[PDB]
Symmetry: D2
Subunit: 123 residues, 4 copies
């Protein structure tokens, strides 16, 4: 249990801010603020993490979702991050993500972006 | 608002069962039961959806996460689905997903599977 | 060796046409014509396939690339398909793909689409 | 045209070596040696790149495939890298990749890994 290790404020390589609380039972709750794209201010996030990881030096699997609707903007889109927490002096969350736009059927082939974000506790 | 359209039981092409409730504010909550892999019985899911989609025939963006720990098994892994709800007589949720395993650093290159699931309200 | 099984004309769910020759040594060469996007007429493709697959009922791994430049248009982008050939009366090539646009550094986060195409020998 | 910029030896973060020649017409040809996985020595690669990129500071889209069969080993799998070349004093190729294994139909859900590699001209 990395409940303590995961809870807090994280920053990615784009300068986005991910604020999360890890629950004892596996829940992730918080807010996400993107430095890029059709986004302003904070958005609700929720997700899950493995609350009883392997003790063999493996990371801790987790994921979360943001739907890009808040009181300011609606980008008609959602991102999910899937990744792992790695603890220690340079803790990180290493993720891959999928961002789906709501599209017509004709445009569904071009609905989903993929990328990768690495989160740290500094900067 | 597809709060009503999205809430309920869905089935994918693998025979997995996704039971979800859509909240007015954008929340998704429920359970997931995989027909395949290192899984048994139900797992908690959470996610988000666009509660005010475009009215131009576009789908409704959404996503959710399952961490593959329950009272029965722990697969030290998490899947996120990112996709869109499309309503009407043959409603569907069309997704792409990322499944991350907790791994050592040496094995992190091989940590993440990607695939695609389509959910329907029958079968 | 599925040199014979793979060589020929294939069609995907979008109505795109993939014309390929499989070489004895593993090469794939041909042309691709997309039914969608910033594309017209045929584009060169090249790729590779496993020329000595497992004999246990497994599929045949393969992949190919199209850069979306031809004499007609230049979409400053490239798609790679990664997948497997499955032979028999309803032969198919089942793929996932990544389409990268050339972007500025500022826009690199939004450079890559992901999707999935299934190719058949009819329609 | 980055025919000159792209041709040569590149190294990724895993310590893999990618040796490529860029043709005037868009072709990529060469060899790949993975530092990790079920691989030994060099494998043939082929791919494509945009031979007439935008002149607005954008990168150069490209992709390539390796099928993991050579005289030494056959991993019954293929990787495709999709990405962009960015030139200048710290030139890089930034990619996302999909590695498909040949699988039975029952196991096709777990056939494809996704990841990201960054290639540089040093180390």
């Amino acid at each position: 249990r990395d409940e303590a290790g995961i809870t807090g404020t994280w920053y990615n390589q784009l300068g986005s801010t991910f604020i999360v609380t890890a629950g004892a039972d596996g829940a992730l709750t918080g807010t996400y603020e993107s430095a890029v794209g059709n986004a302003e201010s904070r958005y609700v996030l929720t997700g899950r993490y493995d609350s009883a990881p392997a003790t063999d030096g493996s990371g801790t699997a987790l994921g979360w979702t943001v739907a890009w609707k808040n009181n300011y903007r609606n980008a008609h889109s959602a991102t999910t991050w899937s990744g792992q927490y790695v603890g220690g002096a340079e803790a990180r969350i290493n993720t891959q993500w999928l961002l789906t736009c709501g599209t017509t059927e004709a445009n569904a082939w071009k609905s989903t972006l993929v990328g990768h974000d690495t989160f740290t506790k500094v900067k």
